[PDB]
């Protein structure tokens, strides 16, 4: 229910870890 913390630019949300992490470009 509680909305996850928004990831800054350069990060995105990884459901596996329930946290923001580094996230590169999808191709």
């Amino acid at each position, epitope marked *: 229910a509680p909305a996850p913390t928004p*990831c800054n630019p350069a*990060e*995105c*949300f*990884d*459901p*596996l*870890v*329930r*946290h923001c*992490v*580094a*996230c*590169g*470009l*999808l*191709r």
Partner: antibody, heavy 125, light 108 residues
Framework: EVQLVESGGGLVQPGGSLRLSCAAS????????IHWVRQAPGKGLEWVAW????????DYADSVKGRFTISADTSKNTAYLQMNSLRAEDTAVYYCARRVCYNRLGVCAGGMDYWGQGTLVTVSS | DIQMTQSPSSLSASVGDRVTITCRAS??????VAWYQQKPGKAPKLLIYSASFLYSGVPSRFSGSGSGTDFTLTISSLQPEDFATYYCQQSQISPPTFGQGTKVEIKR
């Protein structure tokens, strides 16, 4: 380029303990999850643990939970696996791996792209 | 926890054959399945991530599909160097459990 250099393998007594290290280059481990996977002789791949070092979050397979402790040191850019109360069934090649993530609509599209060379742990007297 | 079931356990297929390996999840895992190739006693190799996306460098003859529960790794034209054990892994819900594997042998 990315490199994960493992160390600390070897032979140990049943009940004994051992510490694997997984030293990283070419990226910062704090922003990524580091994972341990292992292969017992003549068995499938078995995921054992992960750590998200930025905050120190962890998760464990039931098979190892309460005996192994995964951790990381951000300044040394290295992750660890402390293994205690070892048993014959822990005899395996232990690999460490990085989970890479790519941004797909705000969430991680990822998998384990870079891997250490794997280090043999033999539990036996 | 979530269980990944691969099929078949193993197979034998000729150079040039299309090879289809299936991988099923006990629960809905979105598209968060990866496919890995492992040569004996060596580090596994990431082939596909997020169900259908190709990891840079991987030969184009490997492809993946599916979402939710049913996933498939396809090798369009089997080459001799492709014998290995192929594993699917889901990373939607921790713990990220592997499937049993599928050992591909080259028929000749």
């Amino acid at each position: 380029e990315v490199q994960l250099v493992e160390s600390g393998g070897g032979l140990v007594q049943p009940g004994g303990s051992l510490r694997l290290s997984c030293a990283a280059s070419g990226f910062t481990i704090s922003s990524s999850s580091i994972h341990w996977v292992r292969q017992a002789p003549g068995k499938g791949l078995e995921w054992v643990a992960w750590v998200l070092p930025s905050v120190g979050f962890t998760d464990y397979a039931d098979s190892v939970k309460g005996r192994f402790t995964i951790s990381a040191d951000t300044s040394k850019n290295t992750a660890y696996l402390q293994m205690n109360s070892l048993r014959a069934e822990d005899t395996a090649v232990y690999y460490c791996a990085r989970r890479v993530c790519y941004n797909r609509l705000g969430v991680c599209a990822g998998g384990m792209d870079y891997w250490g060379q794997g280090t043999l742990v033999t539990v036996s007297s | 926890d979530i269980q990944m079931t691969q099929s078949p356990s193993s197979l034998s297929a000729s150079v040039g054959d299309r090879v289809t390996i299936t991988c099923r999840a006990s629960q809905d895992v979105s598209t968060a399945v990866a496919w890995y190739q492992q040569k004996p006693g060596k580090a596994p190799k990431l082939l596909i991530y997020s169900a259908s996306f190709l990891y840079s460098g991987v030969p184009s003859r490997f492809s993946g599909s599916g979402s939710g529960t049913d996933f498939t790794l396809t090798i369009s034209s089997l080459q001799p160097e492709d014998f290995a054990t192929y594993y699917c892994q889901q990373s939607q819900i921790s713990p990220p459990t592997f499937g049993q594997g599928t050992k591909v042998e080259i028929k000749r």
